[model samples]
Target chain A: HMEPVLVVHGGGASCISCERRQRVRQGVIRAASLGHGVLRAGGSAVDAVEAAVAALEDDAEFNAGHGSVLTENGDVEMDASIMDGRDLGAGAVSAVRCIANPIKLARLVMDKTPHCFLTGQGAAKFAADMGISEIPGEQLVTERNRKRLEKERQEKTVGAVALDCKGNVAYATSTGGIVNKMTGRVGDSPCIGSGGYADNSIGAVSTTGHGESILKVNLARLALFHLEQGGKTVDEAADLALGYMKSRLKGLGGLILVSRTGEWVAKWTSTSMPWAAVKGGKVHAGIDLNDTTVTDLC
Target chain B: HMEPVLVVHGGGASCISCERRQRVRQGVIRAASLGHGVLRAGGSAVDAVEAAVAALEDDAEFNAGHGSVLTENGDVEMDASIMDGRDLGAGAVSAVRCIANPIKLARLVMDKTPHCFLTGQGAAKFAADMGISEIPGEQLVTERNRKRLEKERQEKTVGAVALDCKGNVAYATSTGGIVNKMTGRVGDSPCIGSGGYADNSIGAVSTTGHGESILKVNLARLALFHLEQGGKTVDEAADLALGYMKSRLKGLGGLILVSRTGEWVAKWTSTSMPWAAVKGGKVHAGIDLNDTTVTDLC
Candidate 1:
């Protein structure tokens, strides 16, 4: 928990052209403060990062639990996948509700159940069986989302995965992509096989983008397979998996991977921004929207 | 059958975004019209292009349906799919509503039975009996969804596929991604072995996004294997195979398909906006979204 610090945020945090890059930088700083608090208080790396991400997710403007995309029908079918490096345990979900941050619940699933993921009534039932006080789907909605959707398409999901120095690795991905979505429309954010996957032997990955495109690439699986069978590193494996999209998918997407050795790499198909914070107190992220450049710390 | 022409309105007829970046260009014009509409109307490739991707699914502003991107979780869930060139069959679904998209229904399991693309309670039952209607899911409220949460997540399924074209060729594919999605969720999109498949010998394909990723991939086996092994035309092969997602699915979704010989393909991932149309007197069809620019016109 005392490792340096790194903070990552979803796109739409700021427009560099608007001289708001500093705002983003400041946001990261604020996040860093939390990380520092966690470490100072003797929290684990997982707890520290989870705290930071949860803060971001709670931020109306950051795009995570509350600020995510709406289903075609309009609801928060939040998805999240979390994998622990210590045991290589992972879990995920789709078209679910009640649990605010899916990542936490995913972590719970990994630790508590024999299943990797659950969905619909089954997923909801799982949440209930766990005795977690369920919140109505409406509790997750924010006024900002309603107003935003009144004028635009809903946004995508947010997630993070890390390989700490303790030789333990974990990955998490979360999101609410495009509002007014149909029922049962899940994305790669939750699919351990497509968007989030961890292999202590190689690396762990978290993806954000068109769920369809991610599936087309078989992203997480491809990355692991390439690393295991092709003898490629984290970046090489990611590239190989991404390359698969060349023949099939369209639009933009991205991924972040952390190798067993603590090496990390982030790549994107669109000109969007993805944040990364290292245990060594390093922070690097940008939106690259054509020209403007902005950075700030919360 | 011209009800409303939206290039990606957030929802309803009032909400609209002025951001030019929200516009979709390429895939829009191609399948905005209807691919199968070409064959249905005695058209060709050019006509099918217009029919398949005319304006419905082109507007980035909207998910793929009219207002598009409304999900069961009050988020946007996108969906898409496409099929072959030679075949005269296809399928698709986007910004779905109730009357299950003709694509998913027509492609895999064309029937009057139940279970098409389960969404809400009513929608799910309709799927069981094959019905279509509209849900107030994306209706809209000031700070929350228009309606209260009857269900946590809505089902948005979309896809496309194809078979041999009159013993010649075929193609198919679907577009759109999930909205406020869960982590492990993998819709019908990009399901390699299930949702959809294509082969030079069989044809090309497309699919909607949402639900049972593994099953969706598996559903494509028969057709793909047929082509890989050699047999029926794209149209003949996929004429009524859309039923796979029905009884076989752990959950309901949608899909589309087509052949190489200028045949058609289509399917729905969910309830409505399973909308599609063809222009240029061709089999071309527009699933969801909207198209503004047309390049390959006959």
Candidate 2:
């Protein structure tokens, strides 16, 4: 039995409206379901994580993909990465403006190209050459996002970590960056070992928070290090990783971990982080940091 | 007294022309001298690394800055990153076309912005807003690099690592990507913890070689992992990291390391990796992987 874990960080401090929070909750459920189905159907761990993140990217409630936030110049620039723990193959894209699914493009970078990363106009052009679906730049913008541009609050990101029945693990993350962000700014989303890291020997980890703070400590890598090097469990490793951020940085964030043994843990320094999981034919979701409920989904 | 160490990797095998090899050697000497002088004068580790990398970027011999190779569309797009071990603060730029010294711009992103990375047109625009010096896009292209685009060689990158009087470590790397490569393709140079990683608690590492292989193994971070978590010394850590790349992925690459304890090591799976180092009031430089010679530059 494989457990699929997915976590998404929006923001803290009552910035998101109650109406939008409900919609985000629904999106998280749907994403978890889709990913869980993939794993149950004998899909690879990479495919499962990609399916989960792509679902969120298509959902308008979160700040990614279809309804991505605008840059300082009022255009959407997105970043995403996918890593396969079994072989450690990874792919990523940065400043991609017109891709309908940035996570899929990240997979292409991993599966097809000799390179592991792409960005900017070059990434868009590569998407076209590779026949990945491309959307018009204007199509990614929405009325709500345009309005949020005027009152930009905090940075947010969505990520997924999964362990397949075959004992392989995969991690993926995607983001639209901060509203009104400088056009070229890149968060930790597309950086391997920083935003996301997976190794079959230890486990897989996904981090979402302030990009700068996350980048500073290699949050995801730190968690895996604790597991592989320190012999810590998933819960202890996750705490150690996030603890480093809390002690050293002044930003809010969260992380999720799934060990090779199929145990999983999610924690955040922020006031709240919304997450969902599918295990043993059951589905579980939570928006409160203090929530500790589990069920068998299979 | 604190010993500051600097190391750089040029292309391997028959990629670099004999004429260019001599010029590149000169640039390495000058870069090592500049960085060593900075530490001797009580400069910070981060500043010394930036200075050394900037000198290489300015030199026309290496494939960075002014003489960077051309993209598939016959334009120069560069990537660079710098990290400070004191706080793990890092900055990087990708697919930047107009910046003369990408390493310096990376430093600006580290010290000025709330973010860690920027890229492409947005990076160029950010350079303008930050009042960073800009040269015409054509100024970065040279007749020599334009011709080399035809015989396009394997991937190569230049980087330096240092430890200063304050016991701080830093790593910096810059690249023009593979010759005549796909547009928008990002290499390992600007990917933190892959191309570069530095932490005062453990050590500093910089990598140059196959981007895909390096990303898969998290080469730089693995080096530091061996030091901090596995009870390995600088030399053993470097070897363990590169050995993984060779045995697991058949990837050819070289890495340089400096532990916080003031010890240093450089190694590669490739036949030859040209490098120069300064430690203990003496300077050491070599192009042959097997060469082991030491000299007193002071």
Candidate 3:
């Protein structure tokens, strides 16, 4: 009962069809499976989430670390961040090439530096200081990542947030920008205040959407504010934010959130949506979810 | 033959950029009037493309839908697609919220429904019955359909394709995956086989990147396979397939091509890709246009 609940997702992946159900994998299944394993072991919610996300990190179907997006210049510049609601601490990276499991690196940063984020050579030096092993640049991405770069030239990143039984919560996010993204286009995933945040007094949120808009909205902070005052359920609060974004930002992407009160929220639009659930004691997952005006199946 | 070539773009219906254009209009402009109109009265190739796309769509400053990247779950479903060539076919869709300008909806699918694409309630039903149309039900999406019990999604639909006089050709693309799309959800634009396709046997081609991998890949098939077949001139193969899309498939978004016979060709990727051309031809009443040095100058 001490482990935390973890919600993780594949990073930096895109499809070209509205028929997303069949194309995208529902990461929640693995997330819930880990929850079950932790519950069986009588571990804390944090442990369950960690195990689940770790497993997701290892899953070949999604993109993150080993399955990252490539840069247009033929390199893999990764990004990641982690937040702890217990202390509301977070750390991130913008363009760190040759790293695996950016989440692991982000965790190390939170524990090591006074900074919230690191970039380029600085991030690499920090990783080395933390004793984290670095792999060949090629190890940063895969054939799938290469194909996406060759075609669309975009990045891929992962994000995770967990709520522990101790009432404390945490959030993490990572990314590899568009293959040909202007040299230093640091997407929101690696921006602590933008795509990563956690506050025990409010909630934990990790965003995965168009970076520019997320930055402009200060997404994580906005979500937290809504939960504190709007009296809106996690999903409802997210929807409200969605409304604001539609009339203002107009683009594609989504986010994942978990509140200290055991509220697990996953909402999205367009064709392929993210999946999540409250597991450990229960299992749940949704695939190819979208906010299309119509619903073929409930 | 005199006709005005038209151009439209994906996402943000921003005003045309006057700084870059020979002229500008506050609202969407009609190319058919200036150059094409002149061509109709005996003008040149330069007249139509410059006057059309320039007046219709050429501003990139607007975030996706009306400006730029959409916030999935927020509403900014931006759609786009294109096709062209006398011998090939193609289509695509991009940053769209509720419309199905998925080039496949018009260019390849509607025209070649028995073989390629489909969309909306009417479109689906038509596909079920094997036909394509601008019917209201055509935009009936599965989820949105269930939400409002079959209300049409109100979103812009833009596309284009062309067959140049020189018979040589090429294609281009652009989009913002639905105003607000799930992070990994690709739209119809980037879809390969489904959203787009081309046959170098007729011409070079491409589809805007969006929805799914398969769909995005569809747009470049002909060009990648036939044009890259070793000895085919890029233009010749581009035009060959372009012709096929225009004559055999539905006219979706935008397309461009270069025919084997040396004729240049083009089409809208989504409503339009700001375009222009240059050649030598006399303007004649009712003559669409045939001239040189065309640019997307509103």
Give all TM-scores, in the order shown: 0.51, 0.93, 0.46
Q: Indicate whether candidate 1 or candidate 2 has the larger TM-score.
A: 2
Q: Highest TM-score: which candidate?
A: 2
Model 3: what is its DockQ? 0.01
First chain TM-score, candidate 2: 0.92
Compose the digit string of candidate 2's lDDT tens values, residues B12-57: 4434557776766667777888887888888888888898888888
Candidate 2 TM-score, C-alpha based: 0.93
- Return whichever of 1 and 3 wins on DockQ: 1
RMSD of each: 15.7, 2.8, 21.3
Q: What is the lDDT of residue B105 in candidate 1?
A: 31
Tens digits of lDDT, candidate 3, B162-260: 223333232323344434333223343433333333333443333432222223113345443445456776555544444444443333333443343
Query: Which scores higher on DockQ, 2 or 3?
Result: 2
TM-score of 1: 0.51
Model 1 steric clash total: 264
Estimate candidate 1's alpha-carbon lDDT, on a 0 to 1 scale.
0.46
DockQ of 1: 0.06
For all candidates, state DockQ relative to the true structure: 0.06, 0.78, 0.01
Instruction: Tell me each candidate's i-RMS in Å.
Output: 7.9, 1.2, 19.3
Candidate 1: where are CA atoms >4 Å away? Answer: A1-52, A85-88, A136-139, A153-156, A229-233, A289-298, B1-298
The prediction achieving the highest lDDT against the true structure is 2
Q: Give a tens-digit lDDT track for model 2, residues A143-248.
A: 9888788667444377888888888999999889877888878888898888889888888888887888887777889888888755678888888888888887
